[PDB]
Coordinates of C-alpha atoms (C1' of nucleotides) in Angstrom, one line a residue:
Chain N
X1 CA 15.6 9.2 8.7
X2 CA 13.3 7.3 6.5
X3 CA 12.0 3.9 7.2
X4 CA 12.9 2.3 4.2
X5 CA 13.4 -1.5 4.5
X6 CA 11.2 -4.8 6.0
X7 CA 12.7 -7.7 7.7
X8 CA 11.2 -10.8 6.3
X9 CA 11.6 -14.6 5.7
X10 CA 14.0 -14.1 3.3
X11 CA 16.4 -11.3 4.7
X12 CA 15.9 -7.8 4.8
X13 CA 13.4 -5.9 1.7
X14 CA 12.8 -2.8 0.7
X15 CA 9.5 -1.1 0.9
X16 CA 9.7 0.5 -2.4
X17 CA 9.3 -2.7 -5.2
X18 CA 10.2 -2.0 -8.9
X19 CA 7.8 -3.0 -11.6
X20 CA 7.7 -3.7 -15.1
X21 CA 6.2 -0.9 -17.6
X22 CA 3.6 -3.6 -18.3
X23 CA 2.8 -4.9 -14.8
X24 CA 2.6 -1.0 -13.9
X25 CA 0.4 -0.5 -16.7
X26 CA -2.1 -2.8 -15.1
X27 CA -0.8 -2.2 -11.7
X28 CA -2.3 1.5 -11.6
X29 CA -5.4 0.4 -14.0
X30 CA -6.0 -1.3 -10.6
X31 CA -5.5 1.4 -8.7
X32 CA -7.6 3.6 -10.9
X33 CA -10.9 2.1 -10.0
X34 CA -10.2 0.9 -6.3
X35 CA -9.3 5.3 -5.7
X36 CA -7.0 4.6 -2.9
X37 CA -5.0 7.5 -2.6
X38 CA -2.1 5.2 -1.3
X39 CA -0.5 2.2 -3.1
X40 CA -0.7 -0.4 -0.1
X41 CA -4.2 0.0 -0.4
X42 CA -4.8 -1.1 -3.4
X43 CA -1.9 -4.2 -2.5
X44 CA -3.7 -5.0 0.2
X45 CA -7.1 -5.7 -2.1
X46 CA -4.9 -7.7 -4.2
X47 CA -4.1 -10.0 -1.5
X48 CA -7.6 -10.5 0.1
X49 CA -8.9 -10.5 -3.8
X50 CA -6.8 -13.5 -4.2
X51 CA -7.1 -15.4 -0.8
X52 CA -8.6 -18.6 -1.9
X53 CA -5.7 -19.1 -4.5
X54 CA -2.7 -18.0 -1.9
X55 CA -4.4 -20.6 0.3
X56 CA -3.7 -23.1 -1.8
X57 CA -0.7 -22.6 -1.8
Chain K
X1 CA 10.9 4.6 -16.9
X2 CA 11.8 3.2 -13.7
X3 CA 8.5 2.6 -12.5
X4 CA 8.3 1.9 -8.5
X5 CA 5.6 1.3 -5.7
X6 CA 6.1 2.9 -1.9
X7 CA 4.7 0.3 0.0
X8 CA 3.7 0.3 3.7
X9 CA 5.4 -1.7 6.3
X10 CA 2.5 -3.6 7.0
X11 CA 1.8 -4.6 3.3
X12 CA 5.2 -5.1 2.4
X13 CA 5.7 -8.0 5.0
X14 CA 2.1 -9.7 3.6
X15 CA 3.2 -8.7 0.0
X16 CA 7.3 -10.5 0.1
X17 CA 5.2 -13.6 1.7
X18 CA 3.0 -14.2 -1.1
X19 CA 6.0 -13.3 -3.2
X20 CA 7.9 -16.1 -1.5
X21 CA 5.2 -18.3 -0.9
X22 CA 4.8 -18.3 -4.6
X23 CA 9.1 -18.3 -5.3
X24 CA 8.8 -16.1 -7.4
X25 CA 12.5 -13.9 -8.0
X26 CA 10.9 -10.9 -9.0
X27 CA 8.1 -8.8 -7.1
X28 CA 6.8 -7.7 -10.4
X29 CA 5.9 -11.2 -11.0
X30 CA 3.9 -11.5 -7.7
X31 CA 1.8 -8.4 -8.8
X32 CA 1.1 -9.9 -12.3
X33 CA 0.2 -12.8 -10.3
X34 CA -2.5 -11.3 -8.0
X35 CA -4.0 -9.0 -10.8
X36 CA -4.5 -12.0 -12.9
X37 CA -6.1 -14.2 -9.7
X38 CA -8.1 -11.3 -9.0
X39 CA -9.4 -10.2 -12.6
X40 CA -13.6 -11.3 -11.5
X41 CA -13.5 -8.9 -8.6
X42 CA -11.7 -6.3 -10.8
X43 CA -13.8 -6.4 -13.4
X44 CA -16.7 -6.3 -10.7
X45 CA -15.4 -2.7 -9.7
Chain X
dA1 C1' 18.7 -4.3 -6.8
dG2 C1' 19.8 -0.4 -2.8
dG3 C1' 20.5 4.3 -2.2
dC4 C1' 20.1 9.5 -2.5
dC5 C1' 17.7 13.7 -3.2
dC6 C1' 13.9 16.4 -4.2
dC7 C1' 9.4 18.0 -4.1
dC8 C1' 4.5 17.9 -3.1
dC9 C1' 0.7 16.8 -0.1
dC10 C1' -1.6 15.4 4.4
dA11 C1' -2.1 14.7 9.1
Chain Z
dT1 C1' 7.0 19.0 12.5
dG2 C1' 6.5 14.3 10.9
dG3 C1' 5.4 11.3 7.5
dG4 C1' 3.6 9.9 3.4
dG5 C1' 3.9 9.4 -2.1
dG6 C1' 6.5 9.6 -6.9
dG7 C1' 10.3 11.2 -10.2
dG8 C1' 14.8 11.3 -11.6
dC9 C1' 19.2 9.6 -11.3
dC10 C1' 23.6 6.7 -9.8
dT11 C1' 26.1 2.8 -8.8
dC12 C1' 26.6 -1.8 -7.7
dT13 C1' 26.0 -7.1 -8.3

DNA sequence: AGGCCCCCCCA
DNA sequence: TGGGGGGGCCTCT
């Protein structure tokens, strides 16, 4: 009923991603000050935020 | 206690390939990865 | 880690 | 109505 899973590189991966108490800690610090009211909001930031350094490699 | 993130279809496909881009096993340890390459335009906010 | 259920809110 | 989010819990590898 619910879509619940991704199909990537790797095999198939669920939408919903655990996360250590610490990295939520800092996790929703984030999302604290960006005030998305949705997760993948604030996910996507992360990514664009850290372009240069995903680009090399 | 068993702290979880709903992510949408769209960012979990550009999320797992930074994850495996990175090889990291863990997703948590692709978020602790982009907080920490991020921290001058978080502590910009 | 995947899966279920629930409940709340929004569109 | 449909679809989103999180909490709480279980069961497996």
């Amino acid at each position: 009923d619910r879509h619940s899973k991704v199909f990537t590189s790797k095999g198939p991966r669920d939408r919903r991603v655990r996360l250590s108490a610490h990295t939520a800690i800092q996790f929703y610090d984030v999302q604290d000050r960006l005030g998305y009211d949705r997760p993948s909001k604030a996910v996507d930031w992360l990514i664009k935020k850290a372009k240069t350094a995903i680009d090399k490699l | 206690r068993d702290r979880r993130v709903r992510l949408s279809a769209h960012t979990a496909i550009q999320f797992y390939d930074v994850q495996d881009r990175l090889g990291y096993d863990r997703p948590s340890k692709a978020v602790d990865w982009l907080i920490k390459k991020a921290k001058t335009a978080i502590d910009k906010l």
